[PDB]
Amino acid sequence: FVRTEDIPLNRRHFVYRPCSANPFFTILGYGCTEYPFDHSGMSVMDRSEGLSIDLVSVPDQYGWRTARSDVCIKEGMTYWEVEVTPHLRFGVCRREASLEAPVGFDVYGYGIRDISLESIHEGKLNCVLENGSPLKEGDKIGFLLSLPSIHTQIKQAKEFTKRRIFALNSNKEFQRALEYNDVVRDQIAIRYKNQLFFEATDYVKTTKPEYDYYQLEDSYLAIFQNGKYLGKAFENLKPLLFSELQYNEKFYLGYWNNNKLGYYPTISCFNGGTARIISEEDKLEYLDQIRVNTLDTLYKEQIAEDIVWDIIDEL
């Protein structure tokens, strides 16, 4: 396993991305690369500095560290398998979770433990499943993640707005004065040690939004071990339309969605506990027992959405 030496890693709420020279763009000079490879893989920008490398681990003396999948699961039904003193964790987490903390230490991520398959969220452990079947060194863990249609999440967000505009507010006037379908991204080109990356702002942890707790409509997290499901990990998945970016509100008050909102499959490594995640149907092992699309499809979809939005945002 090797570490990264000259890449800007995701920290201080900033995300980076490599670009390549694209001469069709006049205002901007560069466009996003496909990847250092064809298929989806381990996102090197949002890793911990101590997270070494489809294979990831930390040395045997390092605390919990995590990596996220590149593809952002917004809605629908996605299935995959993760191939497995050294502990690990498998789960899913939003962007607000820290790469330094084990998935499930905050309220933005939900995960499962390697030993005893316990479910971890808000830093608390759960034993919802009664099967209690131990996991060995060569097991393949499937994940079926079902999320509501975009329209229902949008209407749930609109309900949140209609509450917030006056029900939760009764500089108030400015707050009351403050696009759901439309994506607006923020990207700046930077050069770090002769290398070229894009800088984008990220989201911060805030108070949990309440009203009944916010839940994605008919959202479900299902886990399988060698074809056998072990239950639903969670139902009341948090909406995210709920996700305030880091914002210097003081600045704009004094003067007076980025297409990446969703849950990412996240892999955590502790004291050398390695694993790998599977993305593509050819190396998918239980794709038919559901009856559907693999993660790689959504990878290509995200590539297309990014390049098309890059096209339109030039003018």
């Binding site: 694209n22 069709f24 466009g31 390049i307 096209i311 003018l315």
Partner: peptide, 29 residues
Amino acid sequence: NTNVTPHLLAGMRLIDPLRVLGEYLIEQS
């Protein structure tokens, strides 16, 4: 970038129902 980027840029520069873009998209090909 090789395939569709210049046709898209020219079409958005042209932009009137979406039918006008659908046709300009065909006429460019």
